From a paper:
Death-associated protein kinase 2 (DAPK2) is a CaM-regulated Ser/Thr protein kinase, involved in apoptosis, autophagy, granulocyte differentiation and motility regulation, whose activity is controlled by autoinhibition, autophosphorylation, dimerization and interaction with scaffolding proteins 14-3-3. Moreover, the C terminus of DAPK2 contains a motif recognized by scaffolding proteins 14-3-3, whose binding decreases DAPK2 activity, both in vitro and in cellulo, suggesting that 14-3-3 binding may suppress DAPK2 activity, in addition to autoinhibition and homodimerization. Yuasa et al. showed that 14-3-3 binding to DAPK2 is regulated by Thr369 phosphorylation at the C terminus of DAPK2, which creates a mode III 14-3-3-binding motif RRRSSpT369S-COOH, where pT denotes phosphothreonine. Indeed, our crystallographic analysis and fluorescence polarization measurements revealed that Thr369 phosphorylation at the position −1 from the C terminus creates a high-affinity canonical mode III 14-3-3-binding motif whereby 14-3-3γ binds to DAPK2, as in other mode III motifs.
To characterize the interaction between 14-3-3 and the putative 14-3-3-binding motif of DAPK2 at atomic resolution, we solved the crystal structure of the phosphopeptide ctDAPK2-pT369 (sequence RRRSSpT369S) bound to 14-3-3γΔC (ΔC denotes C-terminally truncated 14-3-3γ without the flexible ~13-residue-long C-terminal tail). Our FP measurements confirmed that 14-3-3γΔC binds to FAM-ctDAPK2-pT369 with a binding affinity similar to that of 14-3-3γ (KD = 161 ± 7 nM). The 14-3-3γΔC:ctDAPK2-pT369 complex crystallized in the trigonal space group R3, with four 14-3-3:peptide molecules in the asymmetric unit. The structure was refined to a resolution of 2.7 Å, and the final electron density allowed us to build all seven residues of the ctDAPK2-pT369 peptide. ctDAPK2-pT369 occupies both ligand binding grooves of the 14-3-3γ dimer in an extended conformation and interacting with 14-3-3γ as described in previously reported complexes with other mode III motifs. The phosphate moiety of pThr369 is coordinated by three 14-3-3γ residues, Arg57, Arg132 and Tyr133. The C-terminal Ser370 residue of DAPK2 forms two hydrogen bonds with the 14-3-3γ residues Lys125 and Asn178. Moreover, the ctDAPK2-pT369 makes several additional polar and hydrophobic contacts with residues from the 14-3-3 ligand-binding groove, including Glu185, Asn229, Leu232, and Trp233. Our measurements confirmed high-affinity binding to 14-3-3γ, with a KD of 114 ± 3 nM for the phosphorylated peptide. As expected, no binding to the unphosphorylated peptide was detected.
Author numbering:
A (entry chain C): 2 to 234
B (entry chain G), D (entry chain E): 365 to 370
C (entry chain A): 4 to 70, 75 to 234
């Protein structure tokens, strides 16, 4: 039940497409209270992203069905669809809160003062999962999770502008998700487009100095950025 | 459409 | 009752086949016969569940055979976890079949009886897939029984182009090939079913031709793979 | 490549 076999079990679960078990193994590895290496960090990220993404896809499907069953006016049908959507939503919220607890209690806390890369990574994760909580929240709790995601994204972006290269995939993904938060969560297309274009231009300014692998990793996220930019018009 | 994320 | 069925349809649209299987299991536990749509919903739900389990188990077994005592022990323990999950799903399906589905078939409802006996043979074959040693024997024999009966009934009261009979022949030949390692009997059964459906291929008219031709092409593919 | 079932 040691760290090596836990990481191996996470890799196994990934190969077996069983991402709940992968997330559980990486949660145990994180609960060992020791800092995570880049490989363990990426394994945890992939596991919990796949879990939350499955829950998000199910929630999207059921909510899209609910929006039409509501316009049709069937009482029992809309009641059952709403109940199932709430079930999937509670699952999604539980996964998100599990990730946020792992971040606040273990991951962000054990970051050294000079570990700006891990700080940006974990704050981006916090912002992403609070945004996922915002996708399903209504009322004052929606504003609360929006403020949490905003603070996480802003802190991560400041640390990233100070200590990370514009072409680093972590910074590019942070800027992409921050712009998506501005556009889809805040309905603020101006600052969303501004941040996305600023990130794209800062990456263009140094794209020539990248290795092949770095070039590919950065250009993928830059493609995502310019696709989101073209979409926002 | 939905905005592309990470 | 219809709320459970629409919940199963929602779960299928949400790709949550555990919830779909649970909803169709409740519908079956209502002790009433299942319509064609509900029968297909139950079949699809439990097939997807057990298929996810089978895929995970095959991945883990391939990795276990392809590969340190601690790592090997961890791999074996994970494979055992997945084996237990798969056997639990199969036992749930078999209990549903023996307690409600097969039991509620009248002496003349040959279509649903063949359908449920084919399902029983399928899930006993899924048990035998992961079974090793002595315990394997019984779960093979049951799979041979549920198929065999389902064969005779379908041989006597159903047309050779019926999709239920064709799928039964397909899974029965697969059983004979992969479980009992009897390629001659498997090829014989598959070819007999295929040619019997070919001889009366003109009887399909725009309503059941696709559901039969797909299974016939699966039969032909298995036959060309075996020879 | 294993045998195809329904």
């Amino acid at each position: 039940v040691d760290r090596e076999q836990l990481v191996q079990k996470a890799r196994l679960a990934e190969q077996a497409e069983r991402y709940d078990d992968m997330a559980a193994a990486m949660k145990n590895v994180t609960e060992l209270n020791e800092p995570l290496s880049n490989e363990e960090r990426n394994l945890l990220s992939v596991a919990y992203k796949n879990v939350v993404g499955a829950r998000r896809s199910s929630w999207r499907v059921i909510s899209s069905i609910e929006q039409k069953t509501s316009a049709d006016g069937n009482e029992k049908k809309i009641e059952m669809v709403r109940a199932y959507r709430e079930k999937i939503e509670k699952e999604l919220e539980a996964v998100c809160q599990d990730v946020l607890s792992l971040l606040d209690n273990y991951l962000i806390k054990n970051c050294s003062e000079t570990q700006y890369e891990s700080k940006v990574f974990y704050l981006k994760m916090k912002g992403d999962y609070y945004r996922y909580l915002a996708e399903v929240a209504t009322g004052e709790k929606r504003a609360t999770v929006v403020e949490s995601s905003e603070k996480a994204y802003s802190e991560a972006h400041e640390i990233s502008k100070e200590h990370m290269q514009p072409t680093h995939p972590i910074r590019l993904g942070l800027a992409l998700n921050y712009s998506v938060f501005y556009y889809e969560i805040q309905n603020a297309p101006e600052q969303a487009c501004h941040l996305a274009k600023t990130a794209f231009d800062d990456a263009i300014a140094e794209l020539d100095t990248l290795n092949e692998d770095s070039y590919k990793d950065s250009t993928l996220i830059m493609q995502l950025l310019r696709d989101n930019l073209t979409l926002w018009t | 459409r939905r905005s592309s994320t990470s």
